[model samples]
Target chain A: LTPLMVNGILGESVTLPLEFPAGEKVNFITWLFNETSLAFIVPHETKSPEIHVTNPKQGKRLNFTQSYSLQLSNLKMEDTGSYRAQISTKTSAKLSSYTLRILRQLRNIQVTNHSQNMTCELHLTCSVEDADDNVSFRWEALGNTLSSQPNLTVSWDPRISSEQDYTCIAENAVSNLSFSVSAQKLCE
Target chain B: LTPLMVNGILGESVTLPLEFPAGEKVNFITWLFNETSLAFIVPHETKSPEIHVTNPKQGKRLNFTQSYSLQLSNLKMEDTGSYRAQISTKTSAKLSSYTLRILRQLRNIQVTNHSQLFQNMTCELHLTCSVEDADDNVSFRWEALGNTLSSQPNLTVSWDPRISSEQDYTCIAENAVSNLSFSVSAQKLCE
Candidate 1:
């Protein structure tokens, strides 16, 4: 029942920690991928054995120790699902569950000029692929926060020429990515 | 002995990928940390299935695959080293090497005012910037979000309380790795 939700980088791995007391008689342990069994650890009548998974890919990607913790490697977008672990002991039984959410780095972030001839107005946008539903955006210029929205517009003048730096930050619960460009790169 | 360099941020995990034809047989593999054995896996003739590390902390932080790739978790500054992997099959031997470099982050940057000099409507403000548990090689620069300022340790600027009631100023400390900044308003110094 710890870390009910987790965000993982699309290509990275995640480790979830679960602890059970020592010197106790354990009965059964089962882990589910939503409803399918990704892995399970059961105590033998006399000796405890390693955990097992039927699916080859699941077996390759999943790992656990006698501590009953879990690790998932080579994360993917489709890997987002409910991971539930059911454990039973001689005196008590408990369930540990998690909803895995996947997110990738920000995709194409751009600063485009929407101005006409002899006019100086700049427009910037931050875009991402395979982002989550809780993605948030913010824009910065010369290391200063300019806007909280994904798109930003600014008018240029002598006080602010086409030689400074600008950036956009895209963030979710698990990861934050930023893209930067010079004003000259955006205007000229 | 090709070139492989990996850059890792402080307090983050890094994975080094190795591809060996997915379906190839391996005899023995040894990964060197700074020219010494960090971890090694030699499929046991009896019961030698786990990797061995000379350093205990590294033993806990290191993981690998039968395919010969390595993953270092919770990377620290001391983890920076030359990591070279040697693997041999029945007919050929392969060596995959990497130079791992670690970079630290700048955190808890504080900007404080030293003093203020008043000249009627205009006042000159003095401010200093510092970071906690910082490296010695970091350089500091002063900036005004929209304008240019001095590139010194402390910010020194003349502001007019009448002409401009307030102005935002910042102090940035940086290195070849990363930079962090802290900002303060001029009004915070006056009155």
Candidate 2:
């Protein structure tokens, strides 16, 4: 099986499927190899990575197929990596593979007033133009406090002056960035 | 990881060990995406190959030494194939691989002695060679048959016996001693 490469947003669903073949059973050798969710998740659980070799199960995950390609669905951040396939027989073996690169987890965020006189009630909203729950969201004010995840909103606070730009950062294991704009006092 | 091509003898074993970063926790990832034994084995039965991917599986596969090679041993006619490692993280996936091609699987067969009394009673043992096995861009074939091949003279046969140039040698063997050897034969005097 050849490798695959895909770029997508974090917290959103992505698809990474192997290239398809023309005829039935693209090649020969029925056995095929499949990696598990835990494989990538567990950065270092089992000893050796049996991908090109054998797996922790002593080679059970390997798949034998005559088809041209294979399919993997519901790709996540952890799934946006590398993959390989081995076509072997009693006398010979061949290799085909590809890579998967997820687009940087991008999130758009903005801040504004929710009450009269802009009561200093800082209200921050973290929005991803297009993403799945695979990404994480967090906010940080000018001061020492950090806003929780998903949403960063606080009632009128005099300390949240216009000089500070309420920042919202979007991140995934592979990438990270922050978006922010100045907070204002309407009644002042 | 990337795919690698390996050339070796048939019937021998091929071992491939992966690598990972030093001081990496094994639990962070479950396993490596092993693709070596997959293609020749079965298709659908293989699942979650991405799981084999890890942040530093390369460092560990080689005892935290090198990150590009592995150990494949006790290889069989079937084991003489390729293997791939797909390394992955929470947001990205990468594939690294290696292939193993077994050398020729042909052995030499030899025989001795020839007599008139053993005629018809003896069976011919032979080995067939083909062009498909010609990697050096060369090919040839040879054979021995009929009474003339037996180095017999002054008896029943085709062609004139009076022709002195026609020695009792019906050997039909190719003789190209180039780096690419094709065929050759050797024999002694007979009736």
Candidate 3:
């Protein structure tokens, strides 16, 4: 089966679900990370299925439920990777896999501007304190999308009394943040 | 104790080592992710210690070794976070924690230039060095005329044909994991 794409937040929790064919008696199930054995369970024995954790560093954060789901907590950036479930029955061995990505919330967003000398032109740049690979930038004005680039150049007309407000937004897979500024104030 | 700092590569494996006071029998040890229970082990039973995986999604990726180390495989981007091991014994409860960061190699570095026309014979040239898949901590440096021009991603310089000739400018993009560079000629873009 194809691997499922999953996104997780830093310092949060996520559960990867497993589905077994209806009425298929599961003999055993093994979980693997990056193709290595992590934990496994053997059923049809005592009151509870026999479970084993082969690796310890991540053992404390892993949970294998009776419903056949995998839950991970306190996600660390190092936990990003592939996860697989190998299920063995009387007839067949079923496989389920997932690709997990952990991301942090965007923070410390701000907009700064620089005016070109002797010109009514202003250059505004949007930035974040923590910029990730997945982060993107966009500029908007008067509720309209102006540019997708982090830097925007604006030409101000001193004759106009009303000032225009520009907004800059920075976004990533998990979160987004924005800041706004007045074009007239920046040009002045 | 201060949490151990660990670095992991994307799509790789890492083992978090746990050490217990020598000769102290561990009653039970619990593993936690962000302060939440992930799995645990109960010892002094039959043949082996009884191990349990409380969280399923991470259960398949977790390994609790006989040496009491935590091994995580198939690293993902979302796996970056904190890990802790709670060791319980008849005498005391010990705590060990770790902070993990996952990093990827830098790739697809390139440089581009833009030229703005002016009323005078001189023109303004802006050059930007960028990575297609930039990391959060990537820094940039620009070089030209056999000297360091700027450390920022973008560089602007006034160019005049009468005074300045065609020169190749290079931009280097670097992060903790890797570094790459690209070069472009200013005169080519000016034309």
Candidate 4:
């Protein structure tokens, strides 16, 4: 089955759920974060509750009392990736997995203007301050699609249309932003 | 405690992870989608293989297996929301919750000039921003000369080029979900 996709904002806490079936005699179970072992749950050889958790850092960040759900605190950019749980039963074994994606909100999308005397054209450049691998840029005019490129150029004419509105959009895998201005303001 | 946040694209499937604690005699468990029961799990309550999904549409589009995790398929824009899990035991009650969000991409931001409306050596400019299959509730704002020009949906701002031709003007479009912004300069408009 395709892994579940869980998203969390930067510096926030997140919980990834993991529930075992009631009747199965679970021998061993391990949860991995992008190939690194995050937690290991099994019957404690000599503990009162009988639940034993491996990985000291794992214990610090996870909750496994009623559910095997992992509780991540103060999420960071590196916390994004695949998480999987593998269970070994006395008779058979099985697995469950989820895809955890950390998303940062789109911010600081600003546009600057460029003048072109050659063709009496106006150019606008769109950019972002904190960009990510998934972030992309786009341009639009009068609420219509203009171009997907960050750089846009439009002809300057005073008689045809005195004013026009254009927008620049910065987006990513999880969020997007839009910025708009007047054509005359850009070309004035 | 705050629930985990999960994000997905419109029209796609997303899974919400769930796992049961080891060695517990679980009597029953229910998964809720926006307060409605989407699925149930009961191994000892007379059901075989343990899963009894309540939401028919969800049942056909979901996967319930070795773990009690919930998988949703062919996701729609309306499916974006919250999900919770309630599991019952003989002694106590346990819960897990998640917030799900569906995202759409914005297309682009563009600019246009309103020079004929110029007054006192100032230029009026209009900017528009758009997204593909956008969600409702997006609004626009304008800023220039390090000051906010307008918070209204219309991204219109006037520029006096003689004051400072190098000053930058910007426009932002946003909603509760997310936002984007772009800018232009006074010199570009005045020249």
Over 4 Å off, model 1: A1-3, A20-24, A44-57, A116-119, A128-134, A142-144, A160-164, A173-175, A182-188, B1-191
Candidate 4 per-residue C-alpha lDDT over B1-191 given as tens digits, one digit per residue, 9 for 90 to 100: 46898876556777888767666666556666652445556655354655544445453667764567777777777788888766555554456788988875444654445445544566665654444444566677777767887875455656665564577777787765456777767666654
For candidate 2, lDDT tens digit of each residue in B77-168?
55454455433333333345566665554333222233343323122222233333334423333323323233111122223323322333
Q: In model 2 chain A, which range of ten residues has the least summed lDDT? A: A36-45
Query: Whose DockQ is higher: candidate 1's or candidate 3's?
Result: 3
User: Between candidates 1 and 2, which one is better according to DockQ?
Assistant: 2
Better of 1 and 3 by TM-score: 3
lDDT of 4: 0.65
In the range A8-74, model 3's lDDT, one tens digit per residue, is 9988988889776748767667666762345666665457876766556776899876776888999
True lDDT of residue A2, candidate 3 = 77
Query: Can you write out model 4's per-residue Cα lDDT over A10-115, one digit (the tens) per residue?
Result: 7777887876564866655555565334444554435533333333343455666455567787788777788776664554445577887777777888888876
How well is each residue in A26-144 modelled by candidate 1, as lDDT tens digits?
65565556434455466576676645452345557788865667788899888888776655454444567788887786565544445433545777777766565678888887667
Compared with the true structure, all predictions reach lDDT values of 0.67, 0.39, 0.75, 0.65
Query: Could you give candidate 3's fraction of true interface contacts?
Result: 0.00
Better of 2 and 3 by TM-score: 3
Residue lDDT tens for model 1, B70-117: 889889999998876655454444567788988777777888778645
Better of 2 and 4 by TM-score: 4
- Judged by TM-score, which candidate is best? 3
Docking class of 4: incorrect
Candidate 1 CAPRI category? incorrect
Q: TM-score per candidate, in order? A: 0.41, 0.27, 0.47, 0.43
